[PDB]
Amino acid sequence: DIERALSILQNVTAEQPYFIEAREKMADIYLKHRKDKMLYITCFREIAERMANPRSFLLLGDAYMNILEPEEAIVAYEQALNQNPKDGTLASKMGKALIKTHNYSMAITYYEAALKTGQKNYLCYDLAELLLKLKWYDKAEKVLQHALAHEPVNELSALMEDGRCQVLLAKVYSKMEKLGDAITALQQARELQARVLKRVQMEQPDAVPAQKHLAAEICAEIAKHSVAQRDYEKAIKFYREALVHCETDNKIMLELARLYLAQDDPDSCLRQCALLLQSDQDNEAATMMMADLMFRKQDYEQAVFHLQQLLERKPDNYMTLSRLIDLLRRCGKLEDVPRFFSMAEKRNSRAKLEPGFQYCKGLYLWYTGEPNDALRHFNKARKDRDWGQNALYNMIEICLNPDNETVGGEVFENLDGDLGNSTEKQESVQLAVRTAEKLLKELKPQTVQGHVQLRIMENYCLMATKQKSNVEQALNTFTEIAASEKEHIPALLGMATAYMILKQTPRARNQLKRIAKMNWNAIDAEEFEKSWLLLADIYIQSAKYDMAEDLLKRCLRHNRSCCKAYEYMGYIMEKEQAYTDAALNYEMAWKYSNRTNPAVGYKLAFNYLKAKRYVDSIDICHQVLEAHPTYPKIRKDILDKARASLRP
Amino acid sequence: MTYRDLDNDLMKYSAIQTLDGEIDLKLLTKVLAPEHEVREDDVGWDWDHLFTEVSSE
Amino acid sequence: AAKLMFKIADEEAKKGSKPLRVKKLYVLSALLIEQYHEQMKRFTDNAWRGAEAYHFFILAQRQLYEGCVDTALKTALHLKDYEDIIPPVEIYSLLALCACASRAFGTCSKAFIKLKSLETLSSEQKQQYEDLALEIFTKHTSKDNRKPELDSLMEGGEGKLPTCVATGSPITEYQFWMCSVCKHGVLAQEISHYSFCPLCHSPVG
């Protein structure tokens, strides 16, 4: 009976009580049932005309916001706020509408007037987060310092308010790089928060979990600032304090797990992972951190299986997928991957369009042996803030080194000359090098470590030019970085590679031995694996093959997929006249080239010929001619001598 | 393929993703159906066929 | 038959299916509602509503790909009426996009306020839309540098002009062509471009 409702509400007029609610109901009915915004607005203008007061003007503002007319909403909030200047809720609703209408100076000055009149706790946050989102972090800093310029008030509310103002000033000081002041502000918040707790326990005990959690979060931020100051022991201490406040907060558990990891306690890290997984089984970071610890403990089957279980809970998960892909690369079990792409596609038909899928797919093709398809799939990801940033680094790897060679390795850079002496290979490769600098210009850094890794890879582009001034500049940046950080593996590999290109091979040799003594880690892993291969080449130049074999096998122990680790080892087995074990290495290199390495194709057929396996040799001579028609030498020497033996 | 040859995957769509070289809209662009499925023709429909076609997809 | 065809058109809309497939599904239903009305000789009373919704949603995207972003904006403004059929996310995303490309950043602000209000969104999604809105607002403004005026009809008090199915804009003509099947109007100039009705694909007459 909509007309019974409207006629009753219309029978409430300017001289009667509750006319505001009656006209709001008329407005609401006309918007719901007649779809009429003008009947809604005229009912609301009747409220403004007949019953002008601060609450009716506030409600009129909110009505105009539901109607998407914020200018009349601001007129309504003005008609309220000039009458009740004490209401911080109205001043904040005023602030919201002024922000939605670019009236930022009015919002700022209303919040300043509310703060100067001593209004409620959150107004420091409203003004600070506004100024922060406007990137005026310095204005927020000065505002929060001015909001703390009083002698600290001993009231339980004011202690907690000043504690939150101090926490918020520390959150701003983080963006100011003022991390010591952030610690002092957080310790001053911890001092205030102790005074809060020692009254709350006696006069407000129902607030204890929230106030303990705020004390935990203060201790967590003190710990974060101490990580940025490289005092990881203070970081463990103040995250242990954050646990002593709250033993079961997901981020505090995960962060002390990260620090038990970072300070080489994998057992206490596994305790925090197990507790976190018991508190929530679907915590992806705890599963992946636990899987990495299983991988470090060589429980690779568990590391895989826990990421597989997490993908069977969450099929569309590009972090867990890309972690599982590298576990399967390091195990040498790449054939298991396509299942997990199909699971994402089955859950989400659009998954193929997503930059994290495109990043995971781009990684796979680089490991199967298709650098062009890897580049195509990385390129589709490349602008994304996570997946595109990580794709760009792998595009730069391919654009620097598309054949994945030891740059300056004498066992193979003295070969390939029928292509390597051509302008076609030279100019196309050097264009890829000179445009890897543009991929590096797309890697905008957000940390000093990001700037250093960026500068190193720009200097890897400068090395890869082989122009002497560029290679000397690269050596100089690498030696400058190594002088600032004597263990910085990507710079030490830079020094060695530049020295090899400069023919200063004795200076390269010691700077690689320097790396070879260090323990491996998952971040420097590729530069470790490259450095061991470049040092193994230099050891083959020295003919001391035993140290090369050790480096090649150490490389395979950290990553069983490495085709170059096998291809160098197969060459040593052929030098040692072990044509069978050479054929085993060449069979892996044939397989993991996706049969695109016809030089290994020749070697594999030739080693089968010498092993008195003439049918197997002829099988491979067909596979080489299939892989490449008109490929030189093989037909006459291998294929026709294997045929000629076949019945003697 | 060069870097420029790959960048063709992004070059055309950038004009819908981006405004004045200052703003990026990609979060909103997730709603868009692709141009070749959004295009329409001056071609007629009949109920038997239109039902058969919609049933065949 | 119309009710079951509408049930499919509703589910396939809510899946986020191909927009033109969903236009075809509501057109199949509307033609069955017309066949039930023919058999006489509030789902009963509004036959073409879902066909209009997906038609104007496709037309706004066509006008965006055509670079005609102010026409895309007018068509996307007309979609405000169809929140019962097309989820508000798609409407106000496409409206915010066309408003931003048009430099109607106040109309874009309207669409962003409408988006953030949605109770189906996470705080993360609300924040992501706010981040984009504030990026636009800080880099240009949160106000219209160029103004659409179609809200002059969409407030409903003065009534509404019929939106042309060929263009997604209100018909200002005093008298004009109307489709003998779906009974929507088209501008007497624009109908000359077509052999079949842009909404229902019936032959023009």
Distance from CA of B16 to the nearest CA of A (A): 15
In our burial notation (b when 16+ CB lie closer than 10 A, e otherwise), range C20-54 reads bbbbbbbbbbbbbbbeeeeeeeeeeeebbbbbbbb
Does A380 contact B1 at a Cβ distance shorter than 8 Å? no
Query: For chain C, what is the radius of gyration of the CA atoms?
Result: 18
User: Distance from first CA to last CA of chain A, Å, rounded?
Assistant: 106
**CA geometry: angle A8, A11, A16, nearest 5 deg:** 120
DSSP assignment of A314-343: -SS-HHHHHHHHHHHHHHT-GGGTHHHHHH
Does A375 contact B6 at a Cβ distance shorter than 8 Å? yes
Tell me if A330 sits within 8 A of A291, measured CB to CB.
no
Give dist(CA B10, CA B12) in Å, integer.
6
Distance from CA of B23 to the nearest CA of C (A): 7
- Tell me whether A376 touches chain B (CB under 8 Å): yes
Q: Which residue of B has its CA nearest to A385?
A: B26
For residue A27, how far is the Cα from the chain centroid? 50
User: Distance from first CA to last CA of chain C, Å, rounded?
Assistant: 26
Which member of A380, A432, A438 has the closest CB to residue B9?
Answer: A380
In our burial notation (b when 16+ CB lie closer than 10 A, e otherwise), range A626-643 reads ebeeebeebeeebbeebe
Tell me if A527 sits within 8 A of A489, measured CB to CB.
yes
What are the start-end ranges of the E strands in C45-197?
Answer: 177-178, 185-186
Query: Which DSSP letter does residue C196 get?
Result: B
CA-to-CA separations, A390 to A319, A322, A449, C171, in angstroms, rounded: 11, 11, 15, 52
Name the interface residues of C facing A (CB cutoff 8 Å): 81, 106, 109-110, 113-114, 134, 137-138, 141-143, 154-158
Q: Which chains touch B (3 or more CB pairs under 8 A)?
A: A, C
Tell me if A477 sits within 8 A of A455, measured CB to CB.
yes
Tell me if A390 sits within 8 A of A453, measured CB to CB.
no
Give dist(CA A59, CA A40) in Å, integer.
13
Give dist(CA A276, CA A282) in Å, integer.
10
On chain A, the residues whose CB falls within 8 A of the CB of C113 are: 65, 68, 70, 100
CA-to-CA separations, A518 to A364, A525, B54, in angstroms, rounded: 29, 11, 64
Does C155 contact A68 at a Cβ distance shorter than 8 Å? no
Does C24 contact B35 at a Cβ distance shorter than 8 Å? no
Q: What are residue B23's DSSP bridge partners?
A: B19
- Which single residue is written with the structure tokens 């969104």? C121
Does A376 contact B10 at a Cβ distance shorter than 8 Å? no
Name, in order, each residue with C-beta under 8 angstroms of C54's C-beta and a sequence gap of 6 or more. C13, C19, C20, C22, C23, C26, C85, C86
Does B1 contact A372 at a Cβ distance shorter than 8 Å? yes
Distance from CA of C25 to the nearest CA of A (A): 21
Give dist(CA A165, CA A144) in Å, integer.
7
- Tell me whether A383 touches chain B (CB under 8 Å): yes
For residue A130, how many other CB atoms are within 10 A of its CB?
A: 22
Which member of A68, A101, A134 has the closest CB to residue C142?
Answer: A101
Name, in order, each residue with C-beta under 8 angstroms of A279's C-beta and a sequence gap of 6 or more. A248, A250, A253
Touching C: B residues 10-39, CB under 8 Å:
16, 19, 22-25, 27-33, 35, 37-39
CA-to-CA separations, A532 to A228, A326, A541, in angstroms, rounded: 32, 19, 14
Record the tokens describing residue A402, joined without a space: 């598309």
Q: Which experimental method was this entry solved with?
A: cryo-EM
Does B2 contact A428 at a Cβ distance shorter than 8 Å? yes
On chain C, the residues whose CB falls within 8 A of the CB of B28 are: 93-94, 96-97, 100, 132
The residue among A389, A386, A339 whose CA lies nearest residue A364 is A339
CA-to-CA separations, A70 to A418, A443, C107, C147, C151, in angstroms, rounded: 72, 40, 11, 15, 14
- Which single residue is written with the structure tokens 């690498």? A478
In our burial notation (b when 16+ CB lie closer than 10 A, e otherwise), range A298-332 reads eebeebbebbbebbeebbbbbbbbbbbbbbbbbbe
CA-to-CA separations, C185 to A93, A116, A177, A615, in angstroms, rounded: 44, 60, 63, 79
- Which single residue is written with the structure tokens 């391919």? A398
For residue A533, how many other CB atoms are within 10 A of its CB?
A: 25
For residue C88, how far is the Cα from the chain centroid? 11
Give dist(CA C190, CA C193) in Å, integer.
6
- Tell me whether B44 touches chain C (CB under 8 Å): yes
Distance from CA of A67 to the nearest CA of C (A): 9
Q: What are residue C203's DSSP bridge partners?
A: C196
- Which single residue is written with the structure tokens 């042309």? C164
Give dist(CA A71, CA A59) in Å, integer.
14
> Three-state DSSP class for C95?
helix
Q: How many CB pairs under 8 A join B and C?
A: 86
The secondary element (H helix, E strand) that includes residue C195 is none
Q: What are residue C163's DSSP bridge partners?
A: C170
What are the start-end ranges of the E strands in A337-400?
Answer: none
Q: Which chains touch C (3 or more CB pairs under 8 A)?
A: A, B
Does B40 contact C128 at a Cβ distance shorter than 8 Å? no
> Three-state DSSP class for A153?
coil
Distance from CA of C157 to the nearest CA of A (A): 5
Record the tokens describing residue A222, joined without a space: 């003190």
> Three-state DSSP class for A230?
coil
Q: What are residue B19's DSSP bridge partners?
A: B23
**CA geometry: angle A198, A200, A204, nearest 5 deg:** 155
- Tell me whether B40 touches chain C (CB under 8 Å): yes
Mutate to test the interface with B, among A379, A429, A439 (most CBs of B within 10 A): A379
Distance from CA of A348 to the nearest CA of B (A): 14
Tell me if C170 sits within 8 A of C161, measured CB to CB.
yes
DSSP assignment of C51-84: HHHHHHHHHHHHHHHTT-HHHHHHHHHHGGGGTT
Does A375 contact B1 at a Cβ distance shorter than 8 Å? yes
Query: Which DSSP letter does residue A639 get?
Result: I
Residue type, C43: F
For residue A572, how many other CB atoms are within 10 A of its CB?
A: 20
Q: 3-state SS of chain C: helix, strand, coil percent to 5?
A: 55, 5, 40
Distance from CA of A437 to the nearest CA of B (A): 11
Give dist(CA C43, CA C29) in Å, integer.
11
Does C20 contact B40 at a Cβ distance shorter than 8 Å? yes
Handedness of CA A69, A70, A75, A78 (dihedral sign): positive
Tell me if C190 sits within 8 A of C172, measured CB to CB.
no
**CA geometry: angle C93, A130, A242, nearest 5 deg:** 100
Record the tokens describing residue A600, joined without a space: 């290994």
> Three-state DSSP class for A221?
helix
Name the packing angle between helices A563-575 and A579-592 (round to 10°).
Answer: 160
Query: Which DSSP letter does residue A446 get?
Result: S
The residue among A95, A155, A85, A87 whose CA lies nearest residue A125 is A95
Give dist(CA A212, CA A194) in Å, integer.
9
On chain C, the residues whose CB falls within 8 A of the CB of B54 are: 21, 24-25, 28
Q: How many CB pairs under 8 A join A and C?
A: 40
Give dist(CA A375, CA A392) in Å, integer.
9
Burial class (CB in 10 A: 0-12, 13-18, 19+), B41: exposed
CA-to-CA separations, A453 to A417, A445, A450, A574, C197, in angstroms, rounded: 32, 9, 5, 39, 60
The residue among A352, A333, A286, A336 whose CA lies nearest residue A313 is A286
CA-to-CA separations, B29 to A5, A379, C56, C90, C115, in angstroms, rounded: 44, 19, 17, 10, 15
Resolution of this PDB entry, in A? 3.5
Which member of B38, B53, B57 has the closest CB to residue C58?
Answer: B38
> Three-state DSSP class for A233?
helix
Handedness of CA A607, A610, A615, A621 (dihedral sign): positive
Query: Is the backbone of residue A8 left (phi > 0), alpha (psi -120 to 50) or beta?
Result: alpha
User: Distance from first CA to last CA of chain B, Å, rounded?
Assistant: 36
On chain A, the residues whose CB falls within 8 A of the CB of B10 are: 379, 382-383
Q: What are residue C170's DSSP bridge partners?
A: C163
- Tell me whether B57 touches chain C (CB under 8 Å): yes
